[PDB]
Design a protein around this ligand. Structure first.
Ligand SMILES: Nc1ncnc2c1ncn2[C@@H]1O[C@H](COP(=O)(O)OP(=O)(O)O)[C@@H](O)[C@H]1O
Ligand SMILES: Nc1ncnc2c1ncn2[C@@H]1O[C@H](COP(=O)(O)OP(=O)(O)O)[C@@H](O)[C@H]1O
Ligand SMILES: Nc1ncnc2c1ncn2[C@@H]1O[C@H](COP(=O)(O)O)[C@@H](O)[C@H]1O
Lengths: 104, 304, 69
């Protein structure tokens, strides 16, 4: 592995980007709060484990034409048990991307 | 089993204490293709990866080079009989195949458990990768290994409240394996070496000449070298040819003698950052192997 | 009783905020608070690689998840 990118980039209209992630959230049965037109707090109940996970979405402008959707995990407050806050954060992101987004 | 200084030290330190400030962890979802998973171990400079079952929402096991070896051995054999599934196997489907009736759960450890519990767990489960998993968040923090534990021990125990057994030899402490040593020749093809790995459940094979003297070593770490090529067909070549593709200039094999103190052996192993020394006589004829597991099994039972 | 008027400032969010609080777009792999943020390799051969660095106490782990699409 060589090049790591922060979030994902898009040249779609900002308002389209945000409306589409919002429809994506509702479709996925996550709960959300709009802090800003470009800043969302989102919370999901794990259908298997019954734990809750929180994350932030923030849109940034990187060019005159280009935007960057940023995902950030939020902290809470022998064989293992179900659950991993980090992996679960990865799956939320992935699900959100899959359900609002097409590789252009 | 007794009151050694090593024993007191392990019982008083948490696993957390061994984690480096900063580390990487590669995790595979179990629906991943095996071929891609093994390319990922290499790509990332990593030897083991926790396995996550998305449907179950938990870690369910590890994927290591041993698994890669098993798989590659099976692929080789199946190919000769026109069976080509495996490479398109997903981890999940390989697991239900190999683990058959066997339940074999993921063994892991809390960051707050003792180093003693870690060493005991690695020994008792006969395992080389112990993921440290936080019980509050469920995150794997780190994969703990024998090499890492021995380094920590060497470094953080003062030398001079020294147990009497540290000045005793391998010979008298009976640490290591001295019979039925799995070895190959210069000419031995890679696939035969694979078969030997699978049967003997052993991580390295000393490479010997006609007089039985060691001239090189063929390891499990040396086998993911196959996972960088699109073609696996190069399994028919001699062990010597396979070792040409090694990382750096090769100094020679790391050896020891039956009569060296444990202290000398621990130091050489810790310094060299290798999993084992090949035990040798006056003439470089191989007499045995001393592994990190051997040492750590000795240290946890008070030099036995 | 007169009608009342509303003054609406819209152009604080006309366009998204520009990036740099020195959060890096690209990492070509100790470095400040990129903690908890998602990173990703370009998709290859139908597989997602998701990345992030989290803190346990004073320990930092960068987790990579290889996930089929
Ligand atoms: N912590 C663990 N829990 C359960 N199974 C494991 C664990 N670590 C390794 N294994 C499995 O046990 C076998 C032996 O692997 P091991 O000797 O530990 O690793 P390596 O192949 O890196 O030496 C493999 O099939 C591996 O998947
Ligand atoms: N006794 C030895 N003498 C010389 N080289 C060795 C010896 N043991 C291992 N190596 C080499 O050093 C590398 C380290 O691999 P190894 O110690 O087997 O596993 P690990 O990844 O756990 O260190 C391998 O490429 C191997 O060929
Ligand atoms: N090539 C080998 N032949 C026979 N035994 C070995 C060999 N390599 C390691 N061992 C022994 O097998 C056990 C596991 O070693 P390792 O697989 O290196 O952790 C230890 O007791 C070793 O001494």
């Amino acid at each position: 592995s060589m090049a790591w990118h922060l979030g994902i980039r898009s040249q779609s209209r900002p308002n389209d980007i945000m409306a589409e992630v919002c429809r994506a959230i509702k479709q996925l049965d996550y709960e959300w709060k709009v802090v800003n037109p470009y800043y969302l707090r989102v919370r999901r109940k794990n259908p298997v484990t019954s734990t809750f996970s929180k994350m932030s979405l923030q849109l940034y402008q990187v060019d005159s034409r280009t935007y960057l959707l940023d995902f950030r995990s939020i902290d809470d407050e022998v064989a293992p048990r179900p659950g991993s806050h980090t992996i679960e954060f990865f799956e939320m992101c992935a699900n959100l991307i899959k359900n609002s987004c097409t590789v252009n | 089993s007794n009151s050694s200084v090593y024993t007191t030290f392990m019982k008083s330190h948490r696993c957390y204490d061994l984690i480096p400030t900063s580390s990487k962890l590669v995790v595979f979802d179990t629906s991943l293709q095996v071929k891609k998973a093994f390319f990922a171990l290499v790509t990332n400079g990593v030897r083991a990866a926790p396995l996550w079952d998305s449907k179950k929402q938990s870690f369910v096991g590890m994927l290591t080079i041993t698994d890669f070896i098993n798989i590659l051995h099976r692929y080789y054999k199946s190919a000769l009989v026109q069976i080509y599934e495996l490479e398109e196997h997903k981890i999940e489907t390989w697991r239900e195949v190999y683990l058959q009736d066997s339940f074999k759960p993921l063994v892991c450890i809390s960051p707050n458990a003792s180093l003693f519990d870690a060493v005991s767990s690695l020994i008792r489960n006969k395992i080389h990768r112990l993921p440290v998993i936080d019980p509050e968040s469920g995150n794997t923090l780190y994969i703990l290994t024998h090499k890492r534990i021995l380094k920590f021990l060497k470094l953080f125990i003062t030398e001079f409240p020294k147990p009497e057994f540290m000045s005793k030899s391998l010979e008298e402490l009976q640490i290591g394996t001295y019979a039925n040593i799995a070895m190959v020749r210069t000419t031995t093809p890679v696939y035969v070496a694979l078969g030997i790995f699978v049967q003997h459940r052993v991580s390295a094979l000393p490479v010997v000449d006609e007089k039985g003297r060691v001239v090189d070593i063929y390891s499990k770490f040396d086998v993911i070298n196959l996972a960088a090529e699109k073609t696996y067909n190069n399994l028919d070549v001699s062990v010597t040819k396979a070792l040409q593709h090694r990382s750096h200039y090769f100094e020679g094999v790391l050896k020891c003698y039956l009569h060296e103190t444990l202290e000398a052996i621990i130091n050489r192993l810790v310094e060299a950052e290798v999993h084992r020394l090949v035990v040798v006589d006056e003439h470089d004829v191989v007499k045995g192997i001393v592994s990190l597991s051997d040492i750590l099994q000795a240290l946890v039972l008070t030099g036995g | 009783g007169q009608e009342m008027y509303a003054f609406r400032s819209e152009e604080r969010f006309k366009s998204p905020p520009i990036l740099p609080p020195h959060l890096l777009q690209v990492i070509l792999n100790p470095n400040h608070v990129m903690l908890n943020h998602l990173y990703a390799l370009s998709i290859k051969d139908s597989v997602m690689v998701l990345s992030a660095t989290h803190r346990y106490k004073k320990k930092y782990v960068t987790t990579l998840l290889y996930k089929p699409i």
